[PDB]
């Protein structure tokens, strides 16, 4: 019941940045039947797998807003590590770079990994569990190539493809995109019967 | 004011076993000016600095508690990883084992490292702030020696030893124990003037 319940609703999306705000509703596409905003509510980063941690933020989002929200997580998994740096990609990226990241798997022939992009959505009664709403893209992690200035994207290139995220062109990328993947299945969710 | 005010009360100190808690109250020794009392508290794990995680836990703590208490972390610190895995070690070592921990290191001539213990401790008090003890020891990672059923400690050998954690004796780990090291500085916060 929760989709139908926010047709013609608000929904709070958590970020700082209109051009994030904006990339995400052309994604989710006219017919998506609620209203995103944005804003910038102070969430905890948590330790965890990646969908403890989206449920987890999700609900600290719900104890803030007491309303509709909507929370993205994104991870860069690698397979030899088990999925990790997964959920703390964000501080190897910052202590390795690019160059580094790879360099972390030097001991392990295989270099293949995957990003993932978790939504984690609520109605804000929390008596209705959050709904999460992924997606994934299988690669490997490479030397970087391609400009760096474009978070780990340097060092991952998809499954089919013989350039990195940094060096694909925009339309290339989104077509295999974890993030766009993600966001399909949640324009599924709703349907696009309802506007 | 936080130690004075101290002497003589309740502490709760967050674990689940009874041993534990006898460990610490053990190492402070018996003029540690106040009572330490043992109860499990559910807290998040945070991600962050390791001073920030601490202070982070111990202000959830002090949510929950609203009087006096300490908790503890523990971190093992690559230093060819910019101190990585660090806060996140749990997560490695169950995904690694101490095998993959040191392999992690395959490409980086560099093996030093640090095993790091912070203690945080507040009065329950929101109005006054976290103080942290802290103890390192430097060492090296290396291909694990001894018993394995000791979490990370096989692959981690103390400088000034050819013995890893795993591989010496008890008494000798003691002798250089980061947490013993931070034991020390909140037993030297209180003093011994007191009981």
Request: hydrophobic share 35%; charged share 25%.
């Amino acid at each position: 019941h929760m989709a139908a319940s926010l047709v013609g609703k608000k929904i709070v999306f958590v970020t700082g940045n209109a051009k994030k705000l904006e990339e995400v509703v052309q994604i989710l596409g006219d017919k998506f039947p609620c209203t995103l905003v944005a804003q910038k509510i102070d969430l905890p980063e948590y330790q965890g797998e990646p969908d403890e941690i989206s449920i987890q933020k999700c609900q600290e989002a719900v104890r803030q807003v007491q309303g509709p929200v909507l929370v993205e997580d994104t991870c860069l998994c690698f397979n030899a590590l088990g999925g990790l740096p997964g959920p703390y990609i964000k501080w190897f990226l910052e202590k390795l770079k690019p160059e580094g990241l790879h360099q972390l798997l030097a001991g392990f022939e295989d270099k293949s990994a995957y990003a993932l992009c978790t939504f984690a959505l609520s109605t804000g009664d929390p008596s209705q569990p959050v709904r999460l709403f992924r997606g994934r893209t299988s690669g490997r992690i490479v030397a970087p190539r391609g400009c760096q200035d474009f978070g780990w994207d340097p060092c991952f290139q998809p499954d089919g493809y013989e350039q990195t995220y940094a060096e694909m062109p925009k339309a290339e990328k989104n077509a295999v995109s974890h993030r766009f993947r993600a966001l399909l299945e949640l324009q599924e969710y709703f349907g696009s019967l309802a506007a």
